[PDB]
Amino acid sequence: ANRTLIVTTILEEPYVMYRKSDKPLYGNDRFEGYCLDLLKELSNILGFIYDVKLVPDGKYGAQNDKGEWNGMVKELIDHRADLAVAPLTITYVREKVIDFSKPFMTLGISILYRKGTPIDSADDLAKQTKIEYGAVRDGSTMTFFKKSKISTYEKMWAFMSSRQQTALVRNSDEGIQRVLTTDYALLMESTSIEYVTQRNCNLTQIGGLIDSKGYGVGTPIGSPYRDKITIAILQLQEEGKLHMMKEKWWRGNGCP
Numbered sequence: 001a002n003r004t005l006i007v008t009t010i011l012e013e014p015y016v017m018y019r020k021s022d023k024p025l026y027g028n029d030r031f032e033g034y035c036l037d038l039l040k041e042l043s044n045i046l047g048f049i050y051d052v053k054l055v056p057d058g059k060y061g062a063q064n065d066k067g068e069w070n071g072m073v074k075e076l077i078d079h080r081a082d083l084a085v086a087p088l089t090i091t092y093v094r095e096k097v098i099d100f101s102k103p104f105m106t107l108g109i110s111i112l113y114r115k116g117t118p119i120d121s122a123d124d125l126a127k128q129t130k131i132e133y134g135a136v137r138d139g140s141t142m143t144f145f146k147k148s149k150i151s152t153y154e155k156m157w158a159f160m161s162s163r164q165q166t167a168l169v170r171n172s173d174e175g176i177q178r179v180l181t182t183d184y185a186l187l188m189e190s191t192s193i194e195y196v197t198q199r200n201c202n203l204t205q206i207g208g209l210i211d212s213k214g215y216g217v218g219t220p221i222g223s224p225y226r227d228k229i230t231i232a233i234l235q236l237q238e239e240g241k242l243h244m245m246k247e248k249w250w251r252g253n254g255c256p
């Protein structure tokens with residue numbers, strides 16, 4: 001039998017979530033969401049079973065001062081996992097160190113805040129001094145600001161970096177709590193904003209999308225699965241299955 005593939009992933013609504021049950025769940029049965037459905041589809045097409053393992057450090061992945069990576073990216077580089085099936089953003093810096101599939105979903109960074117302010121854009125947000133802002137530590141939004149040569153974004157990075165202890169949150173859930181409970185705006189991917197703002201009517205997107213990019217399945221460089229995965233993703237795309245999966249996990253339809 002084909003060796004069981006090790007899948008690195010991360011908890012993120014509605015991509016990967018704990019299933020609610022009144023009875024014990026083990027292994028993969030503990031999880032549900034868009035990425036679990038994607039895995040079910042991909043594994044059918046490619047002919048494997050798999051073992052879902054949450055990334056031990058709970059990070060997506062970024063490189064430090066010394067050039068060392070962490071998170072799911074590190075798991076792939078170190079061949080601790082065969083695949084990363086998660087909302088893993090396809091970026092230039094990452095693509096140099098792992099092999100991504102073609103994208104299964106598109107998105108862009110935008111702003112999540114409460115309602116009622118005159119802040120209408122990143123420019124507004126960077127200029128004002130009332131509201132703090134940041135991003136998930138060691139994810140692609142953080143790295144976007146870190147690498148930016150756009151003046152407003154350079155300022156925003158200097159600010160986030162200066163206030164890193166507080167401004168850079170552990171995960172999206174903690175960032176949402178910080179938005180709700182303090183004067184803080186979260187720089188968050190638009191698909192995640194879409195999800196949360198249709199469920200919590202106290203939240204809103206501010207401004208438009210600041211960039212445009214995709215989520216892809218990650219594999220270690222040289223993986224024999226990456227191209228097979230790309231082909232499977234395109235099949236699912238063309239068959240309308242990716243669209244259906246998005247409708248299943250995002251619907252409805254929740255706030256004015």
Ligand SMILES: N[C@@H](CCC(=O)O)C(=O)O
Nearest residue numbers: 060087088089139140141
């Ligand atoms: N999808 C991002 C994590 C979320 C974010 O950075 O806003 C990543 O792959 O690193």
